[PDB]
Write an enzyme that holds these catalytic residues in place. Structure first.
Site, PDB file in Angstrom:
ATOM      1  N   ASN A   1     -36.534  11.723 -35.422  1.00 36.90           N
ATOM      2  CA  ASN A   1     -36.564  11.347 -36.838  1.00 36.90           C
ATOM      3  C   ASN A   1     -37.953  10.848 -37.260  1.00 36.90           C
ATOM      4  O   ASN A   1     -38.120  10.312 -38.360  1.00 36.90           O
ATOM      5  CB  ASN A   1     -35.484  10.283 -37.148  1.00 36.90           C
ATOM      6  CG  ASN A   1     -34.096  10.870 -37.128  1.00 36.90           C
ATOM      7  OD1 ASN A   1     -33.943  12.077 -37.323  1.00 36.90           O
ATOM      8  ND2 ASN A   1     -33.072  10.037 -36.895  1.00 36.90           N
TER       9      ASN A   1
ATOM     10  N   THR B   1     -27.471   6.980 -31.246  1.00 32.70           N
ATOM     11  CA  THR B   1     -27.724   7.624 -29.957  1.00 32.70           C
ATOM     12  C   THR B   1     -27.962   6.574 -28.896  1.00 32.70           C
ATOM     13  O   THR B   1     -28.882   5.780 -29.019  1.00 32.70           O
ATOM     14  CB  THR B   1     -28.939   8.562 -30.072  1.00 32.70           C
ATOM     15  OG1 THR B   1     -28.660   9.547 -31.070  1.00 32.70           O
ATOM     16  CG2 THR B   1     -29.248   9.230 -28.752  1.00 32.70           C
TER      17      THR B   1
ATOM     18  N   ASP C   1     -34.190  11.110 -42.174  1.00 33.31           N
ATOM     19  CA  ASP C   1     -32.779  10.977 -41.776  1.00 33.31           C
ATOM     20  C   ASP C   1     -32.202   9.584 -42.000  1.00 33.31           C
ATOM     21  O   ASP C   1     -32.034   8.798 -41.053  1.00 33.31           O
ATOM     22  CB  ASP C   1     -32.588  11.377 -40.321  1.00 33.31           C
ATOM     23  CG  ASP C   1     -31.131  11.637 -39.981  1.00 33.31           C
ATOM     24  OD1 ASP C   1     -30.257  11.366 -40.836  1.00 33.31           O
ATOM     25  OD2 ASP C   1     -30.862  12.087 -38.853  1.00 33.31           O
TER      26      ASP C   1
ATOM     27  N   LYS D   1     -35.601   7.145 -33.855  1.00 33.16           N
ATOM     28  CA  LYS D   1     -35.749   7.788 -32.562  1.00 33.16           C
ATOM     29  C   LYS D   1     -36.761   8.904 -32.771  1.00 33.16           C
ATOM     30  O   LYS D   1     -37.033   9.256 -33.909  1.00 33.16           O
ATOM     31  CB  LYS D   1     -34.405   8.317 -32.053  1.00 33.16           C
ATOM     32  CG  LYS D   1     -33.689   9.221 -33.028  1.00 33.16           C
ATOM     33  CD  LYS D   1     -32.366   9.721 -32.457  1.00 33.16           C
ATOM     34  CE  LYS D   1     -31.580  10.470 -33.511  1.00 33.16           C
ATOM     35  NZ  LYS D   1     -30.403  11.165 -32.919  1.00 33.16           N
TER      36      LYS D   1
ATOM     37  N   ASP E   1     -31.390   4.448 -37.256  1.00 34.59           N
ATOM     38  CA  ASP E   1     -31.385   5.675 -36.469  1.00 34.59           C
ATOM     39  C   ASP E   1     -32.810   6.081 -36.108  1.00 34.59           C
ATOM     40  O   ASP E   1     -33.148   7.267 -36.110  1.00 34.59           O
ATOM     41  CB  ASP E   1     -30.672   6.802 -37.230  1.00 34.59           C
ATOM     42  CG  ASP E   1     -30.223   7.943 -36.317  1.00 34.59           C
ATOM     43  OD1 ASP E   1     -30.047   7.736 -35.093  1.00 34.59           O
ATOM     44  OD2 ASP E   1     -30.021   9.053 -36.843  1.00 34.59           O
TER      45      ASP E   1
END
Ligand SMILES: [Cl-]
Ligand SMILES: [Cl-]
Ligand SMILES: [Cl-]
Ligand SMILES: [Cl-]
Ligand SMILES: [Cl-]
Ligand SMILES: [Mg+2]
Length: 302
Positions: free
Chosen positions: A144, A180, A161, A141, A139
């Site tokens: 984060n 995402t 995260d 991105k 994750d």
């Protein structure tokens, strides 16, 4: 399952204002009474019943906690304690108070590629640590990528995260569709085998944005974005990449590669000449090239 601490967290911490909230989690600043030190308390809502969709499964909470317990590195968030009550599992986490990296960079008047790589290298060091332990973050991105304290001469990046992170199991392929769209690798989009390589794709996307203020695959619908990702449909449009170095574009090109096996690994990204120049010529080119700050500021403001 694991039996986490059963005491009321309020007996051990004073809690305050919310620092953030996701679909099944709320984060509050807190102060440990015994030490007077500040932490962040992340309250994760338990599913409680398998048929309910109003919380997180125990499998998913335990996975995140188990990964957090293993990791100890300056560029990744640290887990302090875990509590649980009838409705929540509560993670007492290192407080990262400096906000998102991109928001901090967006406050600058200018940023050379040299200066940009100094922040990027911290992300790479954190991911190098994770991948060395066979942990995929899954994750990565900009939201984060945080700063521990924004008011120091050399701010420290913290990756946060770990809600999607997995330990890669040698003996069984992992396939899932999550994350995402803008930031996920083609193999995620296409329900293909996942591994450490997906993080490297995401780093390429983060770098592309860092330098240009544009998102490489973002389309006008979710479906169109996913199509762009799967086709590796992106361009270095001159409107955005006019003063970007050849080295920077090569770095990004070696990451935004459809076949995971052909994608640059974290170890190789750290030896790439844009990150680790091999002569004076390369060093000067990177120092001369600059982030498109006008466009970048608009991204951070989106
Ligand atoms: Cl501390
Ligand atoms: Cl712990
Ligand atoms: Cl997705
Ligand atoms: Cl698709
Ligand atoms: Cl290209
Ligand atoms: Mg979570």
């Amino acid at each position: 399952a694991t039996v986490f601490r059963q005491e009321n967290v309020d007996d051990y911490y004073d809690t305050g204002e919310e620092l953030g909230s996701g679909q099944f989690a709320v984060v509050k600043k807190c102060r440990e009474k015994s030490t007077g030190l500040q932490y962040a308390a992340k309250f994760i809502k338990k599913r409680r019943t398998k048929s309910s969709r109003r919380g997180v499964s125990r499998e998913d909470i335990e996975r995140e906690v188990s990964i957090l317990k293993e990791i100890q590195h300056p560029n990744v968030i640290t887990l302090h304690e875990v509590y649980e009550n009838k409705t929540d599992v509560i993670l007492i986490l290192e407080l990262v108070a400096g906000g998102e990296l991109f928001d901090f960079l967006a406050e600058k008047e200018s940023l050379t590629e040299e200066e940009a790589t100094e922040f990027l290298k911290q992300i790479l060091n954190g991911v190098y640590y994770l991948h060395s332990l066979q942990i995929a973050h899954f994750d990565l991105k900009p939201e984060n990528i945080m700063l521990l304290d924004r008011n120091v001469p050399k701010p420290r990046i913290k990756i946060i995260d770990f809600g999607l992170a997995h330990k890669i199991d040698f003996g069984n392929e992992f396939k899932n569709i999550f994350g995402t769209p803008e930031f996920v690798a083609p193999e995620i989009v296409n329900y293909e085998p996942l591994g450490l390589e997906a993080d490297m794709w995401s780093i390429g996307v983060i770098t592309y944005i860092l330098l240009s203020g544009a998102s490489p695959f973002l389309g006008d619908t979710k479906q169109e974005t996913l199509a762009n990702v799967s086709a590796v449909n992106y361009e270095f449009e001159d409107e955005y990449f006019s003063n970007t170095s050849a080295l920077a574009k090569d770095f990004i090109r070696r990451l935004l590669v459809k076949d995971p096996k052909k994608r640059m690994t974290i170890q190789d990204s750290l030896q790439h000449p844009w990150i680790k120049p091999k002569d004076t010529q390369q060093a000067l080119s990177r120092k001369a090239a600059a982030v498109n700050m006008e466009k970048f500021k608009k991204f951070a403001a989106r």
